[PDB]
Symmetry: D2
Subunit: 109 residues, 4 copies
């Protein structure tokens, strides 16, 4: 190639995997994944949880694995790549919707 | 010490010269658009063709300052950061995720 | 100018000992095991290879590790590679490569 | 099970050189320099097959590249048959930054 496009996530499945098949027997799976980090309340010192949400897509073998083993709550590790579909704002500002294309996946439960 | 891991690593070029602003308190804030390339093989003809993804990146404070001063359209950079997503609601009522990369690190690659 | 990153997930080989440096700082040296399993694409079959990594935790991270982690604990690590030079008893330069941990997350 | 991953960006210490293992395969062992505000770290990296050929063709001393790989420590004996150990990076992917 010439560029690097790489995401590493650890988080939980927000719902049970949704598995489907292309009209020619290809596995496709879509999951929602929540990753968390902590935040310190400045006033009170309370350690509070912050959550980001990500859409992940798996293909073929990996998608089969996902639907075979993973359920809501499942904690997994993931490497993948960002894929974005260009936008346009109410104010005409270019925006970016992002799915993660998964190439690796390690189960952690 | 968080329960999760949210890491992006990118290498690519600025589509445009950086956009920079300051907050009412002075602190800097920069955004750029990054193109990252890979290569696709045309299965029929064997042609080596370039595919491009586009990314919105936000920088803050000192990093933003560095970006304003040093970067330009075409600049090749390395980026470590985190994904920040604001949630959607689709035409067909499906959930979508609009993401910005929040940069923690930046190395210029000439 | 340069990137030196290591990401690992695997299990501790021992209960960690927090020690102190000749400068008074906490250190915890541990080993971590990562494994690759694959089937030989012809002759042999189910192959499994294990790698042992040397990890150095310093200061608070050292103390956390000393306090929470135990042998076999499943842990996640980000860090940097450092090789150091020492001498054997006959004065020959020998080398050891270690992961200087930046971050760690408990997966258990 | 387990993640063993390395990412580097730095420069080759020497013009790379394709050689061959006793199995016949291609391989280039090179060193890569990475630095921090200043201390320089030297990594042994190993490319095999295709990557090795590609590395041997296009890279010279001081070539800035990007690498992903896995860590591997192999065991060997010195003259006196004492177990010694070397940590090398087995590269999966490589990109030229020049």
């Amino acid at each position: 190639a010439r560029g690097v496009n790489k995401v590493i996530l650890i988080g939980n499945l927000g719902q049970d995997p949704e598995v489907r098949y292309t009209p020619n027997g290809n596995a496709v799976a879509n999951v929602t994944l929540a990753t968390s980090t902590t935040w310190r309340d400045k006033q009170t010192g309370e350690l509070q949880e912050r959550t980001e949400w990500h859409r992940i897509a798996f293909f073929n073998r990996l998608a089969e694995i996902v639907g075979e083993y993973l359920r809501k709550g499942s904690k997994i590790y993931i490497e993948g790549s960002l894929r974005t579909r260009k936008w346009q704002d109410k104010n005409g500002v270019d925006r970016y919707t992002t799915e993660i294309i998964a190439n690796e996946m390690h189960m952690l439960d």
